[PDB]
Ligand binder design. Sequence first.
Ligand SMILES: CCCCCCCCOCCOCCOCCOCCO
Ligand SMILES: CCCCCCCCOCCOCCOCCOCCO
Length: 623
Amino acid sequence: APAYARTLDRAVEYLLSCQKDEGYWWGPLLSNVTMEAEYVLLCHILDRVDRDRMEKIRRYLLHEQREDGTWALYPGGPPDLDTTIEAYVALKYIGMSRDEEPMQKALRFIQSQGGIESSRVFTRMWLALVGEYPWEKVPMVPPEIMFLGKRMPLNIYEFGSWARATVVALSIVMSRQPVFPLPERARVPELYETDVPPRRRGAKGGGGWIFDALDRALHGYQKLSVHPFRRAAEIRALDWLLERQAGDGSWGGIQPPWFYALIALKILDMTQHPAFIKGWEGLELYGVELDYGGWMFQASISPVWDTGLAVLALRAAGLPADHDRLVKAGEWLLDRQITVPGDWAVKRPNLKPGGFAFQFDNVYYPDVCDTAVVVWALNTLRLPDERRRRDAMTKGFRWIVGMQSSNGGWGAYDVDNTSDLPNHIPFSDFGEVTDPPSEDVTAHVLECFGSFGYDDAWKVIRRAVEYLKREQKPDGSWFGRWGVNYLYGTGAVVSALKAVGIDTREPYIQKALDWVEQHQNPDGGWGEDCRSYEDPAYAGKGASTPSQTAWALMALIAGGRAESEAARRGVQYLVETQRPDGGWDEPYYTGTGFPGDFYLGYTMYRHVFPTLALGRYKQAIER
Ligand SMILES: CCCCCCCCOCCOCCOCCOCCO
Ligand SMILES: CCCCCCCCOCCOCCOCCOCCO
């Protein structure tokens, strides 16, 4: 048996050993230290500071700090000002003196970059909440935003789902401009002393007279003593949040809206209300005790995604469709299907619910990637209740079809969330504020649809293929919206095109395959650093990683190049780097939350992607 077959066997065993008893897989989702620095400030604001938890956060913050005293958005990344400021503030709050060495190094970096005035809106706002920055200088999000109807400019349904609940809860918070002063010893006036002139970070899409004027007017309005209908607007914001709280207590299964909603409830004197109580208590599910004694808070949690990918990888590796561990995973997945309408129903009010979310319980926010991967995984299994499996797949498939956007692609949560307005408000200087269709999500949908044998005679698929063709870059690659980066998008897109019957001998696909081969590293693997999002010199370039090597391999295998020196060397790379336990290490992030601003380490990718790629490789070589 060739070396790759034994490597595969060991990967399969390792992946099965990671499965939880209930049937799902779930790895920690890594990001950056602003999650934990903001949890420290949240504890301060809510007056619920647990000393033992603070010690573990201190230990984690220091462990994440690099030797030059800075923190980054991803492992090996450039020093990040916003992140370093928040870690410094949380450390001083926990108890480190500004005279300790780690604090001095951090401060030197912070002051070298223009301090607190050069930091993003959310960092200044967290400081305003604790009395360290003026609320008058934070861009206003007025509660009267709730009066804008669904076809009005800047209404909440023009924002992407992850920004929408944030806008609603912050409209309550900014309405009151609450201040929860820090103890004297934790104050940070030193963050205003700068080496260089501070420079305000602006809106990602660029501001403009009308937007600066509106922001100025909203601050002037804020100063008035009477605000007609403001209370009514606040009640709409509160009701909107109360109706949509997720079953785990979060808002949308993600850190920002959750923390801001809890502050909004605190400010409204609702700490004895079940939404606040359950919202507070649910936080522990997202915390992770680390092996070196630290504690972290997950930006989000990925069990459905981890599970659907693991099933696909194990099926590709050779486990039968009725393997008992996969049957258990399949039955667990069937119970996660959502049968109620979510915010997506604003654009699709007659579309029958059938999606899946990322987290365990988040019914109002199913997403296209999880639905595609779960429907596809279910299609590879044989379960005891076949009629239930078929009905689930039909409902999920139909829900994906109904969520297709007008340009032929799919966004993650909504249809046609393409408004250009949210990009120009002062508030939006960080991350993405809208959810337009992207290449990788579209490609995953096509892989799912392709698994049922459909092709571009079906206009849904044809429109999607034309969208991918228009988005292909000049060098032949495809961008990675949610995975790192041109390797991820290129790998997803070529697999998708192959899966729906496109002839991979066409020149545009051959060009993408050559792009993949030209980026292979000397060690035989492929890698792509997160610097790729802001620097063209890093396109398809970085230290090799198991997951990015797997993506490149999948592009080559889908393109008919399994029997090529490039694929042989990639397989050998995976063989040679596999750990004794059958898994792989991956100290670099290969996930993307927001291009340029927020990166993710999906800890299962290093095991599930190599298993998947090696299984596809084996099948291509055997056939
Ligand atoms: C009976 C109450 C009034 C309901 C009438 C609806 C009137 C429509 O709009 C007027 C108020 O809305 C203005 C919104 O504030 C600006 C939005 O967001 C600011 C930038 O983030
Ligand atoms: C603003 C910093 C806090 C970051 C939270 C932003 C949350 C944005 O979503 C990113 C993580 O959640 C993944 C959701 O979408 C689908 C999951 O499948 C993944 C790739 O297609």
